[PDB]
Design a protein around this ligand. Structure first.
Ligand SMILES: Nc1nc2c(ncn2[C@@H]2O[C@H](COP(=O)(O)OP(=O)(O)OP(=O)(O)O)[C@@H](O)[C@H]2O)c(=O)[nH]1
Ligand SMILES: Nc1ncnc2c1ncn2[C@@H]1O[C@H](COP(=O)(O)OP(=O)(O)CP(=O)(O)O)[C@@H](O)[C@H]1O
Ligand SMILES: Nc1nc2c(ncn2[C@@H]2O[C@H](COP(=O)(O)OP(=O)(O)O)[C@@H](O)[C@H]2O)c(=O)[nH]1
Ligand SMILES: [Ca+2]
Ligand SMILES: [Ca+2]
Ligand SMILES: [Ca+2]
Ligand SMILES: [Mg+2]
Ligand SMILES: [Mg+2]
Ligand SMILES: [Mg+2]
Lengths: 438, 54, 425, 345
């Protein structure tokens, strides 16, 4: 058994973290007070769920998680919320004033003064692990803390834990739920200095989550609570292989080995189905074929883009619920004959499949309906580069006038870092085009 | 349409289907970045206070 | 605990500041004696942003009242909420400033500024985490304008990394007290361009036109104008005073509203504005049309004469938040030629459930438009008309000022206009 | 008040659509770089599809199908027809074609030579044509040598040695059909087509003078000496052509040719529908296509190529462009006897 430490940086990372551990506890039968009746080994045990939960002598199951925010408003919700007892105070770190949606302020100014404290707390969780795998870092692209401080934390983690894997869950900026005009700057700045330190990053475009909630859940104006419960379902499907017995994606290294053939192209596209509204009085349960087919519809992807015009490098199918291999292959055969699935020539045209019999857990009173089977598809498509193109375009419009640059320079960052980080994205876009287009 | 590496356990199973075959900055260097940025902030503030003192 | 320190200086600054505290005290359930008598926890959620908490559960505003003559502040201390202000936070002299920027900035004001800064320091020393400062003042007089900008300069020297925010009443010949208002205004704008992060430009002419043409007030008074500024000040600070992370931080608002350091002068706006057909419900579309109508804006600048760099909109009350987004997107998509295309998504919308007193819902408008250049064009024209003949300068040279200081201030303001013009194209 | 942008100033077609849109008083044109648009009349090359459908509150439409190039590229079309079971390698209405890469660079050089030698030995007509600057020859040595002298991919297909010849004149010709596909993927065929005729007599004993073999309006109006003799501008419209088929052949354009054309349009567009459809996409597409056909002496219709950015006959701009606004644009942005024929699915 090898442990995984989760780090949640900034408002988005912290609030998404809250949603995930709420889900993890329901999935593993852990009560809000940390107790787990089904765990017969008190005070210890090397079970699969112990990769995310440590145990005290009193039988409390404590997440292997660190929450970091440069302002205390969001983390104070955890200190006094439903799961206040899960974490001990050392796991919740808060500063006085935030990064003001400013990458340089979070990375340089405020980051420099709290970086060593965060590592010390992370060191404390590391010392409880007999064989630490690595870290899962949740954060936003647009926030000054999510962008600025995460990139610094990633640099240090590569220094203090060189042989460890680091995965990202990054929130891609979407105007419909954003009030910061400089998020394109922060996204590119943080992707530049984080690129060489991340082994595999799952981007979640808020525009996608927002539309799935309006379309499938019939929520007129989705809130962060609506968005984060859905995001935690996807995150749960992705991390389930680490918390339950299994043979696929059993450790963080397998995510790179299975999803990332080239180090820079480490941004798999996630697609989830089905998303059914609990307020729906009547729902027809979807089959293995129908939900597998839905994995190739843009409307359920975490990032809107057209994989039909990209090329696949890898493809994982993670099922949860009543699913047997026979039905999966039958659905795959039918989808190959009907869908536009183009693999690069230097890769096998196949699918790694994972089935967990326990169907997806839904939070009581949540927006999602209890379905008998669901699937999350992880595919490394060049089509995800559309998200970089959009972002880079907005960067170019503002930077051509040096709009807002003075806020970053005033925090001690050199203007040259803008163009440096932008040329790296230009290369990332070219690498995608070299692999995908002919 | 081939299946390989079928692993089964009490909580689920995993397998693979093949349809077709194929054809860092050191701790020191980070301190310099941060301290360099901090210095440039101190320089800009000194020029402000110099301007105000005038 | 993101505290703000409020400073109000001069006649105009203190009369508008007095009404502002009267308006927001009501929204937070604080009575004239500082006791909370509200019925919602949202009122106290962010109450310490503008109020200190004293013994007996009393709430005292974190405000410093400044003036070079006692008159106006005696009226405040005798006014409705006069008892609410900290007695020690009244700092005033007896000489006066004679509507003379030089007296407020260099001679009379200089003799009083240190004792004001002693009160500012005392308020900052009890702030768990001071955001910054907000100053209410006029630019046309002597104290608010001349000493107001002296205070900003000294506050900036002692708190160089805190946000400096002002509500600045711009003079207008149509609502004028003396002929030297362009002189005092041009000198202050010179200071504001350099030392503030955000300045809400409030043109007394627009406030008058609104009271006459829209509110149908036959004979508007300063009190009638101040009702609009109170309502506007309450709206623009909704983001800060209630739970919500839209433009919740003073520094975050600056980051999202100021693309270039010198272009930080905003056109505020408010809807509805109804004459006494005053009980009619206002639909979300109506709120949005009015909020963007020039007649509802207080800089006396037609937005159609320029382009929007950034826009912040706040909606208050219980309304269809879906309908809000629909209408905000309908305005941008129906007049996209009035928004610069090189700042993507430069219109941000925030919502607050608690509406102002006696309104089911309202909307406050904060625009950083290049059209504001016309406001500085007017001031610059009036300035030069007198300064070419050196008219009325002896009032200023008598306080030790030189003509050079006027020329520099004029050049810097004209440069500001030229910078608005280049980004308008 | 709908809004649109223009990114191909050289498009005679959408320059008229842009002129009509403003005429309704309900459409406004924005600078070509403004993203707050409902309609994009985009560039021909490198159209940034990836930035469409991401504007909250705007339903966005574009006048090109992403992926349609598979149909409108000489080399792509050859590959699509051979590798698509819907079309199969035994497709009867498309000339035998091979993709040939210059030696200085898969390739079908050997596969082509096999069919060539088969014809040379069987006494059959062995005259092919090369194109990507065109070369017609009966010797395989010349066709391959002409491709190596270039640096781009070429396609060699059988030359229809028995083309249907109009009379008087004894002259070749090709048929152009305009097809519009809307956001719902209905396939509409413009009721009006054009014939681009050769103003010179067809001579199967001299492929050196390409003026009687190539029916392009540019080659006829520059190298041909009988331009505009039989018809104005070497353009005969369906009305005249159908009357001819009745007088000379006692048949109609519909029965003898149009049925085959409609079947070819359907087959090509329905084939690539899964790859380019914008049905469940965050943005919508429509596109105007120009299909070029040949007719042999047996009244069999052959497919030559598919043009992705076609022009139109000067006499048909008004009707067609209006029809583009009615069925393609107004169907998505409604305003305050159709000219098309529905062949959809
Ligand atoms: N999906 C999702 N996105 C969020 C959430 N909270 C914030 N965001 C997004 O995060 C971006 C803003 O960054 P934040 O994470 O809020 O800022 P921060 O990381 O706390 O950094 P600061 O600037 O110091 O406050 C916006 O694009 C928001 O839409 C959340 O709970 N769920
Ligand atoms: N297999 C074939 N047999 C006989 N003639 C052929 C042929 N392929 C092409 N042609 C001749 O070539 C002409 C069409 O050329 P093609 O369309 O390939 O070039 P192009 O694309 O630059 C002109 P356009 O796109 O405007 O139709 C027709 O007039 C036709 O007569
Ligand atoms: N809106 C408003 N403007 C005022 C008020 N009092 C004065 N003014 C304006 O302020 C300018 C005079 O400055 P004033 O504040 O009286 O001078 P000070 O006391 O020395 O700061 C003139 O332009 C007046 O029109 C007021 O109560 N409300
Ligand atoms: Ca145990
Ligand atoms: Ca590493
Ligand atoms: Ca004195
Ligand atoms: Mg934050
Ligand atoms: Mg006065
Ligand atoms: Mg062509």
């Amino acid at each position: 058994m090898r442990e995984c430490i989760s780090i949640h940086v900034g408002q988005a990372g912290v609030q998404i973290g809250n949603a995930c551990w709420e889900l993890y506890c329901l999935e593993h039968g852990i009560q809000p007070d940390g107790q787990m009746p089904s765990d017969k080994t008190i005070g210890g045990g090397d079970d699969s769920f112990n990769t995310f939960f440590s145990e005290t002598g009193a039988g409390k199951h404590v997440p292997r998680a660190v929450f970091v925010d440069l302002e205390p408003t969001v983390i104070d919700e955890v200190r006094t919320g439903t799961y206040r007892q899960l974490f001990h105070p050392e796991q919740l770190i808060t500063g006085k004033e935030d990064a003001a949606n400013n990458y340089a302020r979070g990375h340089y100014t405020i980051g420099k003064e709290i970086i060593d404290l965060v590592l010390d707390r992370i060191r404390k969780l590391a010392d409880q692990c007999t064989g630490l795998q690595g870290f899962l870092v949740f954060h936003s692209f647009g926030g000054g803390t999510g962008s600025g401080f995460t990139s610094l934390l990633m640099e240090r983690l590569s220094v203090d834990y060189g042989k460890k894997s680091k995965l990202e869950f990054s929130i891609y900026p979407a105007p419909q739920v954003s009030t910061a005009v400089v998020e394109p700057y922060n996204s590119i700045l943080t992707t530049h200095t984080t690129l060489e330190h991340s082994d595999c990053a799952f981007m979640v475009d808020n525009e996608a989550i927002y539309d799935i909630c309006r379309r499938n859940l019939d929520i007129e104006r989705p809130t962060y609570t609506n968005l984060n419960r859905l995001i935690s379902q996807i995150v749960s499907s992705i991390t389930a292989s680490l918390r339950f017995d299994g043979a696929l994606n059993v450790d963080l290294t397998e995510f790179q080995t299975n999803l990332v053939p080239y180090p820079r192209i480490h941004f798999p596209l996630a697609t989830y189905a089905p998303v059914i509204s609990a307020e729906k009085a009547y729902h027809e349960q979807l089959s293995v074929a129908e939900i597998t087919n839905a994995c190739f519809e843009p409307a359920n992807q975490m990032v809107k883009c057209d994989p039909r015009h990209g090329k696949y490098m890898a493809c994982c199918l993670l099922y949860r619920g009543d699913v047997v291999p026979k039905d999966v292959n039958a659905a795959i055969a039918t989808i190959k004959t009907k869908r536009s699935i183009q693999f690069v020539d230097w890769c096998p045209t196949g699918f790694k499949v994972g089935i967990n019999y326990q169907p997806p857990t839904v939070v009581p009173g949540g927006d999602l309906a209890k379905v008998q089977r669901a699937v999350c598809m992880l595919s490394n498509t060049t089509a995800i580069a559309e998200a970089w193109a959009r972002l880079d375009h907005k960067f170019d419009l503002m930077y051509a006038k040096r709009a807002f640059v003075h806020w970053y320079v005033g925090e001690g960052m050199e203007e040259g870092e803008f163009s440096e980080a932008r040329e790296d994205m230009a290369a990332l876009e070219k690498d995608y085009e070299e692999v995908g287009v002919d | 349409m081939e299946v390989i590496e079928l692993n089964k356990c009490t909580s689920g199973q995993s397998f693979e289907v093949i349809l077709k075959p194929p054809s860092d900055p050191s701790l020191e260097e980070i301190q310099k970045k941060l301290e360099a940025a901090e210095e440039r902030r101190k320089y800009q503030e000194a020029e402000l206070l110099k301007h105000l003192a005038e | 605990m993101r505290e703000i320190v409020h400073i109000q200086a001069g006649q105009c600054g203190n009369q508008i500041g007095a009404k502002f505290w009267e308006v927001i005290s009501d929204e937070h359930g604080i009575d004239p004696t500082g006791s909370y008598h509200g019925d919602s926890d949202l009122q106290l959620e962010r109450i310490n942003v503008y109020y200190n908490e004293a013994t007996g559960n009393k709430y005292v505003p974190r405000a410093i009242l400044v003036d070079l003559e006692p008159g106006t502040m005696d009226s405040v201390r005798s006014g409705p909420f006069g008892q609410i202000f900290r007695p020690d936070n009244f700092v005033f002299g007896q000489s006066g400033a004679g509507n003379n920027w030089a007296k407020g900035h260099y001679t009379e004001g200089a003799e009083l500024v240190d004792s004001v800064l002693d009160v500012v320091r005392k308020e900052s020393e009890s702030c768990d985490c001071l955001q910054g400062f907000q100053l209410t003042h006029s630019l046309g007089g002597g104290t608010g304008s001349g000493m107001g900008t002296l205070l900003i300069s000294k506050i900036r020297e002692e708190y160089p990394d805190r946000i400096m925010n002002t509500f600045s009443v711009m003079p207008s010949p149509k609502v004028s007290d003396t002929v030297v208002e362009p002189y005092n205004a041009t000198l202050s704008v010179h200071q504001l361009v350099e030392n503030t992060d955000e300045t809400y430009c409030i043109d007394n002419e627009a406030l008058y036109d609104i009271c006459f043409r829209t509110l149908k007030l036959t004979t508007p008074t300063y009190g009638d104008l101040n009702h609009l500024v109170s309502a506007t000040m309450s709206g623009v600070t909704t983001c800060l005073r209630f739970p919500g992370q839209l433009n919740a931080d003073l520094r975050k608002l600056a980051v999202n509203m100021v693309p270039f350091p010198r272009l930080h002068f905003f056109m505020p706006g408010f809807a509805p504005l109804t004459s006494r057909q005053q009980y009619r419900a206002l639909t979300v579309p109506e709120l949005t049309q009015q909020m963007f109508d020039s007649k509802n804006m207080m800089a006396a600048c037609d937005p159609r004469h320029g382009r929007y760099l950034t826009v912040a909109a706040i909606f208050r009350g219980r309304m269809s938040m879906k309908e809000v987004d629909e209408q905000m997107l309908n305005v941008q998509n129906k007049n996209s030629s009035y928004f610069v295309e090189w700042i993507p998504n430069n219109v941000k919308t925030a919502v607050c459930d608690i509406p102002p007193r006696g309104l089911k819902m309202s909307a406050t408008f904060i625009g950083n438009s290049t059209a504001i250049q016309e406001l500085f064009k007017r001031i610059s024209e009036q300035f030069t008309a007198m300064f070419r003949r050196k008219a009325f300068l002896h009032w200023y040279t008598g306080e030790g000022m030189d003509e050079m200081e006027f020329t520099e201030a004029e050049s810097n303001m004209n440069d500001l206009v030229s910078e608005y013009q280049q980004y308008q194209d | 008040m709908y809004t649109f942008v223009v990114r191909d100033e050289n498009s005679s077609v959408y320059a008229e659509v842009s002129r009509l849109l403003l005429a309704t008083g309900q459409w406004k044109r924005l600078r070509k770089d403004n993203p707050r648009f409902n309609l994009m009349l985009g560039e021909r090359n490198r159209l940034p599809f990836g930035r469409l459908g991401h504007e909250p509150g705007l339903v966005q439409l574009v006048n090109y199908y992403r992926g349609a190039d598979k149909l409108c590229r000489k080399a792509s079309l050859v590959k699509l027809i051979k590798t698509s079971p819907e079309l199969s390698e035994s497709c009867t209405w498309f000339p035998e074609s091979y993709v040939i890469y210059p030696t200085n660079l898969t390739d079908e050089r050997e596969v082509f030579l096999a069919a060539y030698n088969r014809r040379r030995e069987g006494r059959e007509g062995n005259v092919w044509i090369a194109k990507s600057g065109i070369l017609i020859s009966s010797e395989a040595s010349e066709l391959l040598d002409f491709i190596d002298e270039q640096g781009q991919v070429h396609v060699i297909q059988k030359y229809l040695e028995k083309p249907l010849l109009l009379e008087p004149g004894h002259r070749k010709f090709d048929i152009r059909s305009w097809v519009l596909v809307d956001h719902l993927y209905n396939i509409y065929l413009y009721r009006e087509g054009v014939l681009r005729t050769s103003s010179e007599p067809y001579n199967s004993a001299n492929f050196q003078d390409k003026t009687c073999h190539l029916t392009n309006h540019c080659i006829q109006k520059e190298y041909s000496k009988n331009y505009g003799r039989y018809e104005e501008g070497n353009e005969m419209f369906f009305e005249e052509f159908n009357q001819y088929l009745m007088d000379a052949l006692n048949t109609t354009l519909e029965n003898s040719i149009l049925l085959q054309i409609k079947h070819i349009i359907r087959s090509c567009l329905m084939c690539i529908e899964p790859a380019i459809s914008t049905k469940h996409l965050h943005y919508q597409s429509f596109q105007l296509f120009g299909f070029d056909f040949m007719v042999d002496e047996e009244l069999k219709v052959w497919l030559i190529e598919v043009n992705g950015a076609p022009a139109c006959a000067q006499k048909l701009y008004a009707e067609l462009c209006q029809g583009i606004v009615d069925v393609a644009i107004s169907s998505v942005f409604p305003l305050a006897t159709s000219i098309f024929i529905k062949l959809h699915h």
